[PDB]
Ligand binder design. Structure first.
Ligand SMILES: *[C@@H]1O[C@H](CO)[C@@H](O[C@@H]2O[C@H](CO)[C@@H](O[C@@H]3O[C@H](CO[C@H]4O[C@H](CO[C@H]5O[C@H](CO)[C@@H](O)[C@H](O)[C@@H]5O[C@H]5O[C@H](CO)[C@@H](O)[C@H](O)[C@@H]5O)[C@@H](O)[C@H](O[C@H]5O[C@H](CO)[C@@H](O)[C@H](O)[C@@H]5O[C@H]5O[C@H](CO)[C@@H](O)[C@H](O)[C@@H]5O)[C@@H]4O)[C@@H](O)[C@H](O[C@H]4O[C@H](CO)[C@@H](O)[C@H](O)[C@@H]4O)[C@@H]3O)[C@H](O)[C@H]2NC(C)=O)[C@H](O)[C@H]1NC(C)=O
Ligand SMILES: *[C@@H]1O[C@H](CO)[C@@H](O[C@@H]2O[C@H](CO)[C@@H](O[C@@H]3O[C@H](CO[C@H]4O[C@H](CO[C@H]5O[C@H](CO)[C@@H](O)[C@H](O)[C@@H]5O)[C@@H](O)[C@H](O[C@H]5O[C@H](CO)[C@@H](O)[C@H](O)[C@@H]5O)[C@@H]4O)[C@@H](O)[C@H](O[C@H]4O[C@H](CO)[C@@H](O)[C@H](O)[C@@H]4O[C@H]4O[C@H](CO)[C@@H](O)[C@H](O)[C@@H]4O)[C@@H]3O)[C@H](O)[C@H]2NC(C)=O)[C@H](O)[C@H]1NC(C)=O
Ligand SMILES: *[C@@H]1O[C@H](CO)[C@@H](O[C@@H]2O[C@H](CO)[C@@H](O[C@@H]3O[C@H](CO)[C@@H](O)[C@H](O[C@H]4O[C@H](CO)[C@@H](O)[C@H](O)[C@@H]4O)[C@@H]3O)[C@H](O)[C@H]2NC(C)=O)[C@H](O)[C@H]1NC(C)=O
Ligand SMILES: *[C@@H]1O[C@H](CO)[C@@H](O)[C@H](O)[C@H]1NC(C)=O
Ligand SMILES: [Mg+2]
Length: 318
């Protein structure tokens, strides 16, 4: 109280994507784990619970990576989000050639085995069961499950997740759904249905934003999901800019983080937390995905806070 993100956010959590290779780099880069403990009280595994890592061959599970992030989280009594179970990317190659009932059987076994493991071992607050199931124009993404099983795979996946009987909230997660547009409309219609049918609890908004270009009706869109009766969370926040960073963009980034915080706070108890997709710019996915862009997180390459850090603290407290 009130100098850290985690303190300022209470009773909401303020989390970070944590990668196993950075956590285990404590010797050479202690500030990563130190900043995690001092500033954050939520965590999402960056990669190692994804299908390609956790079930690399059929019915052969590898929990090592997920267990490391979960244990770090448990030691610090973080809010832990499981991420993710059904997603067209970072999918083990053997899945992509399965057809029909065979594909569905593999998927049921994936969801059930992974969730049962973490039910018995750790406290998972929420699971991103299905990730990125829609296209920008509001149609269903034609991934392998859609192609083989049709649109019903989405509620069926939540049905399977429910049958594990964990105390985890079940979330659906996506990007470009943060404003009011075709994609968020489509997501909302499906969420309204699934919520009616007791299948989903939460909606995750990734919020991979570009500085000074946030969605115009961010808060209003959050509000209509909350009106549908789900909780929401900001799940993968970063706000990127062109490098080297201009003074104007650094200042605007501060305003943009505050804008996201305020859109969350406006929902009261229904918005449970904010997670940034990483801790420091030094390991951000952005400069390797968008060359010449970066400076997107709250701490720079030397773990010195951005001006956005102060703006986030102030918005959380106010
Ligand atoms: C289930 O899921 C699991 C979890 O995901 C999977 O397990 C993970 O699998 C991945 C992929 O294979 C693996 O990542 C790779 O690891 C490679 C091994 O690196 C480690 O070991 C080497 C070698 O250590 C030996 O030698 C040193 C000294 O030379 C000694 O100190 C060691 O104790 C050890 O000695 C013993 O063995 C030798 C013979 O090997 C004997 O001669 C000796 O007598 C001893 O018996 C180390 O050098 C590495 O150390 C680095 O990282 C650790 C952190 O864990 C640091 O503490 C350490 O200081 C050092 O850090 C430096 O390197 C890192 C990058 O590695 C830098 O970031 C950092 O700045 C430092 O410079 C490890 O301990 C590794 O080689 C490989 O590297 C990749 O990147 C390089 C670029 O450098 C590329 O060129 C390569 O191609 C690779 O892509 C990569 O990181 C994970 O380690 C592994 N486990 C975990 C927990 O994630 C599992 O496979 C899966 N199972 C399935 C699917 O079945
Ligand atoms: C575990 O912890 C360790 C820390 O102990 C982590 O290692 C560090 O990892 C970071 C992130 O990858 C690296 O930062 C990057 O550095 C490169 C340049 O690196 C070269 O130059 C370094 C500086 O060299 C001078 O200065 C030193 C002393 O300061 C002198 O000793 C030298 O002689 C030079 O005068 C040098 O230190 C580097 O180290 C190399 O040394 C060993 C041998 O010792 C070599 O074998 C290795 O190859 C090792 O690299 C190296 O020579 C920068 O270019 C990077 O900046 C880009 O990326 C940033 C984000 O990552 C971004 O903010 C920047 O703006 C910039 O991005 C821009 O440019 C990109 C070009 O690629 C564009 O793609 C992009 O879009 C954008 O436009 C970055 O700063 C550290 O070098 C590294 N430190 C060490 C000591 O290794 C390690 O990663 C951790 N591991 C895990 C798993 O967490
Ligand atoms: C809204 O935008 C979406 C996304 O841009 C767009 O959806 C795309 O539609 C086209 C067809 O109009 C899909 O193209 C393919 O058509 C062939 C048949 O010729 C199918 O075999 C494809 O199936 C996929 O699966 C194959 C394995 O069996 C793979 O080879 C590959 O993954 C194929 O894509 C597929 O139906 C295209 O896949 C989709 N894209 C996505 C992301 O869903 C849609 O047309 C737009 N609607 C509008 C503008 O009204
Ligand atoms: C998406 O926008 C287009 C305009 O190009 C519109 O015709 C269509 O009805 C919209 N889709 C949905 C699902 O609202
Ligand atoms: Mg706990």
């Amino acid at each position: 109280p009130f100098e850290t993100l985690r303190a300022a956010a209470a009773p909401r959590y303020f989390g970070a994507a944590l990668g196993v290779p950075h956590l285990l780099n404590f010797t050479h880069d202690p500030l990563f784990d130190v900043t995690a403990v001092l500033q954050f009280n939520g965590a999402t595994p960056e990669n190692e619970m994804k299908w390609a890592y956790i079930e690399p061959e059929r019915n052969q599970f590898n929990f090592t990576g997920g267990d490391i992030v979960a244990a770090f989280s448990a030691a610090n009594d973080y809010v832990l989000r499981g991420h993710n179970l059904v997603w067209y990317q970072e999918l083990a190659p053997w899945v992509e050639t399965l057809t029909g009932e065979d594909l569905w059987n593999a998927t049921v076994n994936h969801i059930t085995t992974v969730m049962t493991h973490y039910k018995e071992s750790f406290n998972i607050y929420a699971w991103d069961v299905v990730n990125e199931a829609f296209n920008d124009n509001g149609t269903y993404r034609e991934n392998v499950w859609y192609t083989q099983l049709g649109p019903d795979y989405i509620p069926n996946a939540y049905a399977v997740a429910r049958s594990v009987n964990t105390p985890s909230k079940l979330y659906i997660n996506d990007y470009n759904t943060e404003g009011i547009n075709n994609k968020s409309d489509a997501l909302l219609a499906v969420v309204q249905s699934m919520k009616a049918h007791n299948l989903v609890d939460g909606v995750g908004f990734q919020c991979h934003f570009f500085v000074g270009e946030l969605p115009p009706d961010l808060e209003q869109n959050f509000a209509r999901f909350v009106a549908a009766g789900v909780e929401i969370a900001v799940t993968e926040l970063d706000i990127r800019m062109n490098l080297p960073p201009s003074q104007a963009d650094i200042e605007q980034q501060a305003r943009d983080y505050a804008t996201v915080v305020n859109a969350c706070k406006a929902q009261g108890a229904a918005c449970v937390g904010i997670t940034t997709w990483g801790i420091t710019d030094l390991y951000s996915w952005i400069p390797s995905t968008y060359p010449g862009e970066g400076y997107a997180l709250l701490f720079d390459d030397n773990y010195v806070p951005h001006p956005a850090f102060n703006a986030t603290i102030q918005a959380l407290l106010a």
